[PDB]
Coordinates of C-alpha atoms (C1' of nucleotides) in Angstrom, one line a residue:
Chain N
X18 CA 29.6 77.9 142.8
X19 CA 28.3 78.9 146.2
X20 CA 29.7 76.7 149.6
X21 CA 28.5 76.6 152.6
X22 CA 31.2 75.8 155.6
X23 CA 29.8 75.2 159.0
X24 CA 33.2 75.5 161.7
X25 CA 32.3 73.5 164.3
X26 CA 34.9 74.0 167.2
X27 CA 35.8 72.8 171.0
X28 CA 35.9 74.8 173.2
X29 CA 36.4 71.9 176.6
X30 CA 38.5 72.7 179.4
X31 CA 41.0 69.4 178.2
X32 CA 42.2 71.9 175.8
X33 CA 43.6 75.1 178.0
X34 CA 45.5 71.9 180.1
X35 CA 48.5 71.1 178.2
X36 CA 52.4 71.2 178.5
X37 CA 53.2 75.2 177.7
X38 CA 55.8 74.4 175.1
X39 CA 53.0 72.2 172.7
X40 CA 51.5 75.1 172.0
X41 CA 48.0 73.6 173.7
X42 CA 45.5 73.4 170.7
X43 CA 43.8 76.2 172.1
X44 CA 45.2 78.7 170.6
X45 CA 46.6 76.7 167.7
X46 CA 43.1 75.9 166.5
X47 CA 41.8 80.1 166.6
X48 CA 44.8 80.6 164.5
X49 CA 43.0 77.8 162.6
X50 CA 40.3 79.5 162.0
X51 CA 41.5 83.3 161.8
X52 CA 43.4 82.2 158.6
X53 CA 40.8 80.7 157.0
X54 CA 38.3 83.6 157.3
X55 CA 41.5 86.2 156.5
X56 CA 41.7 83.9 153.2
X57 CA 37.7 83.9 152.8
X58 CA 37.4 87.7 153.6
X59 CA 39.8 88.3 151.2
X60 CA 38.6 86.1 148.8
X61 CA 35.5 87.0 147.6
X62 CA 34.4 83.5 146.4
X63 CA 30.5 84.6 148.2
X64 CA 30.4 81.3 150.3
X65 CA 28.9 81.4 153.4
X66 CA 30.3 79.9 156.8
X67 CA 28.6 80.0 160.3
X68 CA 30.4 78.9 163.6
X69 CA 29.6 76.7 165.7
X70 CA 31.0 76.1 170.0
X71 CA 31.3 72.2 171.8
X72 CA 31.8 72.5 175.6
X73 CA 30.9 76.0 176.8
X74 CA 29.2 77.1 179.8
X75 CA 26.0 78.2 178.0
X76 CA 23.4 76.6 175.9
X77 CA 21.9 78.3 172.7
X78 CA 20.6 75.6 169.8
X79 CA 17.6 74.5 167.9
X80 CA 17.6 71.1 169.6
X81 CA 17.3 71.3 173.7
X82 CA 15.4 67.9 174.7
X83 CA 17.1 67.0 177.8
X84 CA 20.5 66.5 178.9
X85 CA 21.3 65.7 175.3
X86 CA 22.1 68.3 173.4
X87 CA 24.0 70.6 176.4
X88 CA 26.4 73.2 176.8
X89 CA 26.5 73.7 173.1
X90 CA 26.2 77.2 171.4
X91 CA 25.3 78.4 167.3
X92 CA 27.5 81.2 167.7
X93 CA 27.4 82.6 163.8
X94 CA 25.0 81.7 161.0
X95 CA 24.8 81.2 157.9
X96 CA 26.3 84.4 156.4
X97 CA 29.0 86.2 154.6
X98 CA 32.6 86.6 156.3
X99 CA 32.9 90.0 157.6
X100 CA 35.8 91.5 159.8
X101 CA 33.2 91.7 162.4
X102 CA 33.6 87.8 162.7
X103 CA 36.9 88.0 162.9
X104 CA 37.3 90.4 166.3
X105 CA 34.9 88.3 167.3
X106 CA 37.1 85.2 167.3
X107 CA 39.7 87.5 168.4
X108 CA 38.7 88.3 171.9
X109 CA 34.6 87.2 172.3
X110 CA 35.8 83.6 171.5
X111 CA 37.1 82.1 175.2
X112 CA 38.0 78.8 176.9
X113 CA 35.2 77.6 179.3
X114 CA 35.2 74.2 182.0
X115 CA 32.9 72.3 180.6
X116 CA 32.2 69.0 178.3
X117 CA 30.3 67.9 174.9
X118 CA 29.6 64.8 173.2
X119 CA 30.9 66.0 169.6
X120 CA 28.6 63.2 168.1
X121 CA 25.8 65.8 169.4
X122 CA 27.8 68.7 168.0
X123 CA 28.2 66.7 165.1
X124 CA 24.1 66.8 164.8
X125 CA 23.2 70.5 166.1
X126 CA 25.7 71.3 163.0
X127 CA 23.8 68.5 160.4
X128 CA 20.8 70.4 161.7
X129 CA 22.1 74.2 161.5
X130 CA 23.5 73.1 157.9
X131 CA 19.7 72.2 156.8
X132 CA 17.5 74.4 158.0
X133 CA 19.9 77.7 157.1
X134 CA 20.3 76.4 153.8
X135 CA 16.9 76.7 152.4
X136 CA 16.1 79.4 149.3
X137 CA 20.1 79.0 148.5
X138 CA 22.1 76.9 146.6
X139 CA 24.8 75.6 147.3
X140 CA 27.0 73.3 144.8
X141 CA 29.4 71.6 148.6
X142 CA 28.9 71.5 151.8
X143 CA 31.0 71.2 154.6
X144 CA 31.6 71.1 158.4
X145 CA 35.3 71.2 160.2
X146 CA 35.3 69.3 163.8
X147 CA 38.2 70.9 165.7
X148 CA 38.4 68.4 168.8
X149 CA 41.3 67.1 170.5
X150 CA 39.2 63.5 171.7
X151 CA 39.9 64.1 175.4
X152 CA 36.1 63.8 176.0
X153 CA 33.9 61.3 177.4
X154 CA 31.8 59.6 175.1
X155 CA 28.9 57.6 174.0
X156 CA 28.8 56.1 170.3
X157 CA 24.6 54.8 170.3
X158 CA 23.8 57.4 167.0
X159 CA 25.9 56.5 164.3
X160 CA 24.9 55.2 161.5
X161 CA 21.5 57.2 161.2
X162 CA 24.6 60.4 161.0
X163 CA 26.0 58.4 158.0
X164 CA 22.8 57.7 157.0
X165 CA 21.9 61.3 157.4
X166 CA 25.7 62.4 155.7
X167 CA 25.2 59.9 152.7
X168 CA 21.9 61.7 152.1
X169 CA 22.5 65.3 152.4
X170 CA 25.7 64.5 151.1
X171 CA 27.9 66.8 153.0
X172 CA 31.6 66.7 153.4
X173 CA 33.9 65.9 157.1
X174 CA 36.9 66.6 157.6
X175 CA 38.9 66.2 160.7
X176 CA 41.8 68.7 162.6
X177 CA 43.7 67.3 166.1
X178 CA 47.0 68.0 167.7
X179 CA 48.2 65.1 166.7
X180 CA 49.9 63.6 162.8
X181 CA 48.8 60.3 163.2
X182 CA 45.5 59.8 161.6
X183 CA 51.6 59.5 173.7
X184 CA 48.5 59.5 174.1
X185 CA 46.0 58.8 176.5
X186 CA 43.3 55.7 175.9
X187 CA 40.1 58.4 175.5
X188 CA 41.7 59.5 173.0
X189 CA 42.8 56.2 171.1
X190 CA 39.0 55.7 171.5
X191 CA 38.2 59.2 169.5
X192 CA 41.2 57.9 166.6
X193 CA 38.9 54.3 166.2
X194 CA 36.2 56.1 166.3
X195 CA 37.2 59.0 163.5
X196 CA 38.8 56.4 161.5
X197 CA 35.3 54.1 161.3
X198 CA 33.5 57.2 160.3
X199 CA 35.7 58.7 157.9
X200 CA 35.8 55.0 156.4
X201 CA 32.2 54.8 156.0
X202 CA 31.8 57.7 153.9
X203 CA 34.3 57.5 152.0
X204 CA 36.9 54.6 152.6
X205 CA 40.4 54.6 152.3
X206 CA 41.1 58.0 150.7
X207 CA 38.8 59.0 153.4
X208 CA 41.9 58.4 155.9
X209 CA 44.3 61.0 155.0
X210 CA 41.4 63.4 155.0
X211 CA 42.6 64.0 159.2
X212 CA 44.7 67.0 159.1
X213 CA 46.6 68.3 162.4
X214 CA 46.9 71.7 163.1
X215 CA 50.3 72.2 162.2
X216 CA 50.0 71.0 158.5
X217 CA 47.2 73.3 158.5
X218 CA 48.9 76.0 159.1
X219 CA 51.8 75.5 157.5
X220 CA 49.2 75.8 154.3
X221 CA 47.1 78.6 155.0
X222 CA 49.3 81.0 155.8
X223 CA 49.0 82.2 152.2
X224 CA 46.1 84.3 151.0
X225 CA 44.4 82.9 147.8
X226 CA 45.8 83.8 144.6
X227 CA 43.6 86.2 142.2
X228 CA 41.8 83.2 140.0
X229 CA 39.7 84.6 137.0
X230 CA 37.7 83.0 134.4
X231 CA 38.0 83.1 130.8
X232 CA 35.1 83.3 128.3
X233 CA 35.6 81.0 125.4
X234 CA 36.1 82.7 121.7
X235 CA 34.3 81.0 118.7
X236 CA 36.1 80.5 115.9
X237 CA 37.1 79.2 112.7
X238 CA 40.4 77.6 111.5
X239 CA 40.5 77.9 108.2
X240 CA 42.5 76.2 105.3
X241 CA 42.0 77.7 102.2
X242 CA 37.9 78.5 100.9
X243 CA 37.0 75.1 101.4
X244 CA 38.4 73.4 104.9
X245 CA 37.0 75.2 107.8
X246 CA 37.1 74.1 111.9
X247 CA 34.9 74.7 114.1
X248 CA 37.6 76.3 116.9
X249 CA 36.9 77.5 120.8
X250 CA 39.9 79.7 122.2
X251 CA 41.1 80.0 125.9
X252 CA 43.9 82.5 127.6
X253 CA 46.4 80.0 129.2
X254 CA 48.6 82.9 130.3
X255 CA 48.6 86.4 131.3
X256 CA 49.8 89.2 133.2
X257 CA 47.3 89.3 137.3
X258 CA 46.2 92.4 137.6
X259 CA 44.4 93.4 141.3
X260 CA 40.9 93.2 140.1
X261 CA 39.8 96.7 143.1
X262 CA 41.6 99.8 142.0
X263 CA 42.2 102.6 145.2
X264 CA 39.5 104.9 145.4
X265 CA 40.8 109.0 145.9
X266 CA 38.4 110.2 149.3
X267 CA 39.2 113.7 151.5
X268 CA 41.5 113.4 154.7
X269 CA 38.9 114.7 156.4
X270 CA 35.3 113.1 156.1
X271 CA 36.5 109.7 154.0
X272 CA 33.9 110.1 150.9
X273 CA 34.2 109.7 147.6
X274 CA 31.2 112.0 146.6
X275 CA 33.0 115.2 147.9
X276 CA 35.9 115.1 145.3
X277 CA 35.4 115.6 141.6
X278 CA 38.0 115.2 138.8
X279 CA 37.5 117.2 135.0
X280 CA 39.9 118.7 132.6
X281 CA 39.6 121.3 130.3
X282 CA 41.2 122.9 127.8
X283 CA 43.4 126.2 126.8
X284 CA 44.7 128.6 124.3
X285 CA 48.9 129.4 124.3
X286 CA 47.1 133.4 125.0
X287 CA 48.7 135.5 127.5
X288 CA 44.7 135.6 128.8
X289 CA 45.0 132.0 129.4
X290 CA 41.2 131.5 127.6
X291 CA 39.0 128.2 127.1
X292 CA 37.7 126.2 124.5
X293 CA 34.9 123.9 124.9
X294 CA 35.3 119.5 123.6
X295 CA 33.5 119.7 120.5
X296 CA 35.1 122.7 119.3
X297 CA 38.2 120.1 119.5
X298 CA 39.8 118.2 116.7
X299 CA 42.7 115.3 116.9
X300 CA 45.8 116.1 114.6
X301 CA 49.2 114.4 114.3
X302 CA 52.9 115.7 113.2
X303 CA 54.0 115.5 109.7
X304 CA 57.6 116.1 110.2
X305 CA 58.5 120.0 111.7
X306 CA 54.3 120.8 110.8
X307 CA 51.0 119.8 112.1
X308 CA 48.2 117.9 109.8
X309 CA 44.8 118.1 110.8
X310 CA 43.3 114.7 110.8
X311 CA 39.1 114.2 112.2
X312 CA 38.1 111.8 113.6
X313 CA 35.5 110.9 111.3
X314 CA 37.8 111.1 108.4
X315 CA 40.2 108.6 110.3
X316 CA 37.3 106.6 110.5
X317 CA 36.1 106.6 106.2
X318 CA 39.8 105.9 105.8
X319 CA 40.7 103.9 108.6
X320 CA 42.2 99.9 107.3
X321 CA 38.5 98.3 107.7
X322 CA 38.8 94.3 108.1
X323 CA 36.6 91.4 108.8
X324 CA 36.4 90.6 112.8
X325 CA 36.8 87.7 113.6
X326 CA 39.4 85.9 111.3
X327 CA 41.7 82.6 112.3
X328 CA 44.0 81.8 108.9
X329 CA 46.7 79.2 108.1
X330 CA 48.8 81.8 106.0
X331 CA 51.1 79.2 105.6
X332 CA 53.2 76.2 107.2
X333 CA 56.8 76.3 108.5
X334 CA 59.8 74.6 110.5
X335 CA 59.6 74.3 113.7
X336 CA 63.2 76.1 113.6
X337 CA 62.1 78.9 111.7
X338 CA 59.9 80.1 114.6
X339 CA 62.2 81.1 117.3
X340 CA 61.4 81.6 121.1
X341 CA 63.2 85.2 120.9
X342 CA 60.8 87.0 118.8
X343 CA 57.0 86.6 120.5
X344 CA 55.4 89.3 121.0
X345 CA 51.5 90.3 122.8
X346 CA 50.4 89.6 126.5
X347 CA 48.7 86.9 126.0
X348 CA 49.1 82.9 125.1
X349 CA 46.3 80.9 123.2
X350 CA 44.9 77.7 123.9
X351 CA 43.0 75.7 120.8
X352 CA 40.9 73.5 121.1
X353 CA 38.3 71.8 119.2
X354 CA 34.4 73.0 119.5
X355 CA 32.3 71.9 123.1
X356 CA 30.3 68.7 121.4
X357 CA 32.3 68.5 118.2
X358 CA 33.4 65.2 117.8
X359 CA 34.0 66.0 113.8
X360 CA 35.7 69.4 114.9
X361 CA 37.9 67.0 117.4
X362 CA 38.8 64.8 114.8
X363 CA 39.5 67.6 112.0
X364 CA 41.5 69.2 114.8
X365 CA 43.9 66.1 115.9
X366 CA 44.6 64.9 112.7
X367 CA 45.9 68.8 112.2
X368 CA 48.2 68.5 115.2
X369 CA 49.6 65.2 115.2
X370 CA 50.5 65.8 111.2
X371 CA 52.2 68.8 112.8
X372 CA 54.0 67.4 115.7
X373 CA 55.0 64.6 113.3
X374 CA 55.9 66.8 110.2
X375 CA 57.8 69.7 112.9
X376 CA 56.1 72.8 111.7
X377 CA 53.7 75.4 113.3
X378 CA 51.6 77.0 111.1
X379 CA 51.8 81.1 110.5
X380 CA 48.1 82.4 110.7
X381 CA 46.3 85.8 111.3
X382 CA 44.1 86.3 113.9
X383 CA 42.0 89.4 114.7
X384 CA 39.7 89.0 117.4
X385 CA 36.6 91.3 116.3
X386 CA 36.3 93.4 113.6
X387 CA 38.3 96.7 115.7
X388 CA 40.6 94.8 116.7
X389 CA 43.9 95.2 114.6
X390 CA 45.1 92.5 112.9
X391 CA 48.1 90.0 114.2
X392 CA 50.3 87.2 112.2
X393 CA 51.2 84.4 115.0
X394 CA 52.4 81.1 115.1
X395 CA 50.0 78.3 116.4
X396 CA 52.7 75.0 117.5
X397 CA 50.9 72.0 118.6
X398 CA 50.7 70.6 122.2
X399 CA 50.3 67.3 122.9
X400 CA 49.8 65.3 125.9
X401 CA 47.7 61.9 127.3
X402 CA 45.4 63.3 128.7
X403 CA 43.8 66.7 125.6
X404 CA 45.5 68.0 122.8
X405 CA 45.5 71.5 121.7
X406 CA 46.9 73.7 119.6
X407 CA 48.6 76.6 121.0
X408 CA 48.6 80.7 119.6
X409 CA 51.6 83.1 120.8
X410 CA 52.0 86.6 118.8
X411 CA 54.9 87.3 116.1
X412 CA 56.4 90.5 114.9
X413 CA 55.9 92.9 111.9
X414 CA 58.5 94.9 110.0
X415 CA 58.5 97.2 112.6
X416 CA 58.8 95.8 115.9
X417 CA 62.4 94.6 114.9
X418 CA 65.7 96.7 116.3
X419 CA 68.7 96.3 114.5
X420 CA 71.3 97.2 116.7
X421 CA 74.6 96.2 116.4
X422 CA 77.8 94.8 119.8
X423 CA 80.8 93.3 119.5
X424 CA 81.9 90.3 119.4
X425 CA 82.6 88.4 122.8
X426 CA 84.6 86.0 121.5
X427 CA 87.0 88.1 119.3
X428 CA 88.1 90.0 122.0
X429 CA 91.1 90.0 123.4
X430 CA 91.7 91.9 126.9
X431 CA 88.2 90.3 127.9
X432 CA 89.4 87.2 127.3
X433 CA 88.7 84.6 130.4
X434 CA 92.2 82.2 131.5
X435 CA 91.4 78.6 131.8
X436 CA 91.1 78.9 135.6
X437 CA 88.9 81.4 135.9
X438 CA 86.8 78.9 133.3
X439 CA 86.8 76.4 135.7
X440 CA 86.2 78.8 138.7
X441 CA 83.1 79.4 136.7
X442 CA 82.4 76.0 135.4
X443 CA 82.7 74.8 139.8
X444 CA 80.3 77.9 140.5
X445 CA 77.7 77.2 138.2
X446 CA 77.5 73.3 139.6
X447 CA 77.3 74.3 142.9
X448 CA 74.6 76.1 142.2
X449 CA 72.5 73.8 139.7
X450 CA 68.6 74.1 140.5
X451 CA 67.9 70.9 138.6
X452 CA 69.0 67.3 140.6
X453 CA 68.8 64.4 138.7
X454 CA 66.6 61.5 140.0
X455 CA 69.6 59.0 141.0
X456 CA 70.6 58.8 138.1
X457 CA 67.5 56.8 137.0
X458 CA 64.3 58.7 135.4
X459 CA 64.6 62.4 134.7
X460 CA 65.4 65.6 136.5
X461 CA 63.5 67.4 139.4
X462 CA 63.7 71.5 139.8
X463 CA 64.4 72.2 143.6
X464 CA 63.1 75.7 143.7
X465 CA 59.7 76.2 140.9
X466 CA 59.3 80.0 140.1
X467 CA 55.9 78.4 138.5
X468 CA 54.2 77.4 142.3
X469 CA 55.6 80.8 143.6
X470 CA 52.3 82.9 144.5
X471 CA 53.3 86.9 143.6
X472 CA 54.6 88.6 147.0
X473 CA 52.3 91.9 145.8
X474 CA 49.4 90.4 146.2
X475 CA 49.9 88.8 149.0
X476 CA 51.9 92.0 150.9
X477 CA 48.8 94.1 150.1
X478 CA 46.2 92.0 151.6
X479 CA 48.1 91.7 154.9
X480 CA 48.5 95.7 155.0
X481 CA 44.5 96.2 154.3
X482 CA 44.5 92.9 157.5
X483 CA 46.3 94.9 159.0
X484 CA 45.3 98.0 159.2
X485 CA 41.3 96.6 159.5
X486 CA 42.6 95.0 162.6
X487 CA 45.1 97.7 163.9
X488 CA 43.7 101.1 162.2
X489 CA 46.1 103.2 164.4
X490 CA 49.2 101.1 164.1
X491 CA 51.6 101.7 161.2
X492 CA 52.1 99.0 158.0
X493 CA 54.2 96.1 159.3
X494 CA 57.5 94.8 157.5
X495 CA 57.4 91.6 155.0
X496 CA 56.6 88.4 156.1
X497 CA 59.8 86.3 156.8
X498 CA 57.8 83.3 154.7
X499 CA 58.1 85.7 151.4
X500 CA 61.4 85.8 151.5
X501 CA 61.4 82.4 152.2
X502 CA 59.7 81.1 149.2
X503 CA 61.8 83.9 147.0
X504 CA 64.3 83.1 148.0
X505 CA 66.7 78.9 147.3
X506 CA 66.9 76.3 149.5
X507 CA 70.0 77.2 152.4
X508 CA 71.6 74.1 150.2
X509 CA 72.4 75.8 147.6
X510 CA 74.1 78.8 148.9
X511 CA 75.5 76.5 151.7
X512 CA 77.2 74.6 148.2
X513 CA 77.9 78.2 146.9
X514 CA 79.8 79.3 149.8
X515 CA 82.8 78.5 148.5
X516 CA 82.7 79.0 144.6
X517 CA 81.9 82.1 145.0
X518 CA 84.5 83.2 147.2
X519 CA 87.5 81.6 144.1
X520 CA 85.0 83.3 141.9
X521 CA 85.9 86.5 144.0
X522 CA 90.1 85.7 144.0
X523 CA 90.1 85.4 140.8
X524 CA 88.2 88.2 139.0
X525 CA 89.4 92.3 140.0
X526 CA 86.1 94.0 140.0
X527 CA 86.6 97.3 140.5
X528 CA 83.8 99.8 141.0
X529 CA 84.7 103.2 138.7
Chain Q
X290 CA 80.3 98.4 105.9
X291 CA 77.9 96.3 103.5
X292 CA 74.4 96.0 104.0
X293 CA 73.8 99.6 104.8
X294 CA 71.1 101.9 104.3
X295 CA 71.7 104.8 102.2
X296 CA 68.7 106.7 103.7
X297 CA 69.7 106.1 107.0
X298 CA 73.5 105.6 107.9
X299 CA 74.1 103.1 110.8
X300 CA 71.4 101.3 110.4
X301 CA 71.7 98.3 108.1
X302 CA 68.8 99.1 105.1
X303 CA 65.7 96.0 105.8
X304 CA 64.8 93.7 102.8
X305 CA 60.9 93.9 101.4
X306 CA 58.5 92.4 102.8
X307 CA 57.5 89.5 100.4
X308 CA 54.9 88.2 102.5
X309 CA 53.9 84.6 101.6
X310 CA 55.8 82.6 98.5
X311 CA 55.0 78.4 98.7
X312 CA 57.8 76.6 97.6
Chain T
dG86 C1' 89.5 149.6 140.6
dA87 C1' 85.3 150.0 137.0
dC88 C1' 82.9 149.0 132.8
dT89 C1' 82.8 146.4 128.4
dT90 C1' 84.0 142.7 125.1
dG91 C1' 85.0 138.1 123.4
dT92 C1' 86.1 133.0 124.8
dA93 C1' 85.0 128.5 127.6
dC94 C1' 83.0 125.5 130.9
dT95 C1' 79.4 122.6 132.5
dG96 C1' 74.8 121.7 135.7
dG97 C1' 70.3 121.6 134.7
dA98 C1' 65.7 121.3 131.5
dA99 C1' 64.5 119.3 128.2
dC100 C1' 63.1 115.8 124.9
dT101 C1' 62.2 111.3 123.7
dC102 C1' 61.4 106.6 124.9
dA103 C1' 58.8 103.1 127.9
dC104 C1' 55.9 101.1 132.2
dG105 C1' 52.2 101.1 134.9
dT106 C1' 47.6 103.1 136.7
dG107 C1' 43.3 104.0 135.9
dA108 C1' 38.5 105.0 133.0
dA109 C1' 35.2 105.3 129.6
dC110 C1' 33.8 102.9 125.5
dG111 C1' 31.9 99.6 122.7
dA112 C1' 31.3 94.9 122.3
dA113 C1' 30.7 90.5 123.5
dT114 C1' 29.3 86.4 126.2
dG115 C1' 26.6 84.7 129.6
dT116 C1' 23.9 83.8 133.3
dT117 C1' 19.6 86.3 136.6
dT118 C1' 15.3 87.8 137.4
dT119 C1' 10.1 89.6 136.0
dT120 C1' 6.1 90.1 133.5
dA121 C1' 2.7 87.5 129.2
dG122 C1' -0.3 84.0 128.2

DNA sequence: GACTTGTACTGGAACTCACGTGAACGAATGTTTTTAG
């Protein structure tokens, strides 16, 4: 569940001295650190992060010894991230003028992550090194370091100014040693685990998505009164809402306890009398009158059912169920009961039969006793890795609207000409968002909308962070990358420039 | 117009719901 | 010119429909901590 992350960073002089255009690695590492801190702060995953620096003038480590383990500092211990850490990163950290051996820094990181982890459970442990590998060092304690990392099961990561992994020989030696360390720890797959500052910034510029864990819903899929298969249902797709809501506070003291909310009731008399809650009964409207209907009477007459029912009313061809009739605000995914082989076999048989016959199951679904029953459609979904049923609600008789719309093909005044059709065809061809893979295998989606984070939460977190760090300044404008991700690639517009002009020429649109 | 409800003019009459009728 | 009666126009309010926010309640299910033997 929780994770402990010891962020170890370089503050040596070699970082400051660099070409101004190159954006010397100190600033890029600082930006990466800050972005990671914001992502962790605004995503409350209950993760612990500590900060270690090497190459600084001061010395504060649990282990000192002699000349070794010097010029290192442990600025932050294992504790939850907070805005104080962001403020400290922004200004309290400045470049130094000394050098240090990053192997000793790794030793100190191991020491802190092993000493401050007692008393807490951590399913994961990480150590990120931020260095340019431009400091002289000696390799004499690598085997013990690898053994300790293997025994403690602690992952490693490296972030360097260059993507490869024009450089000096010392940088090349650093590359060789880090590559050997990565290979020994994991192997071939570990080679790609050496990121660059620019690439990491490309991935850390977006706040983490709102992640919620669905709770399994057990039930029994029933076909008649003799066949029953144990099943578990999860919520696959639903509209996501902010976990936290705004709190009303008084303008001056800024406290929630100094404001109260309550409701009262009155009559139509001029005196504006008041009545108590218990003296109020619910009623309904029947035409031009009001029919009293007490809550107790409603419960007595209420439609009573038996909860937790997943019954197969029948089987119907897939063509008879249209996507436009889907109801509800959720999609359910039904698997076999966990650790149940017979249920898995039965569900697999049903799914395969439905897929082979091209059929879907019209079923009755009720969440619990006090949940209104629903009629829905369950259809198969077979994939190499997994197979399961997909349930989506269906409409009742009252939910269908009978609206009449005039025909467009039979119209004599709204019939497009051949040139207009050709222009529209050219526009559609130019603005295609799917490209064939050299007309060989399949299609590729140029603008996949399922991988775009919701801009609403991004904007909310951006504004909250800006207010936290700058209490006085107003809110900023929307970030450019949000607009970039909310728009298609520029190639589409470049291709569509001319067809749009042709359509404008051919179609006389006038605003009335 | 064919299939027009007498009770509510302008709305096509809705067939009564028969439920499930096995073939 | 001032008042009274009658007709016509019309811009806004009321009402209905639909969606979104925030809260309470029951209800459940699972998970963590405390106490008894």
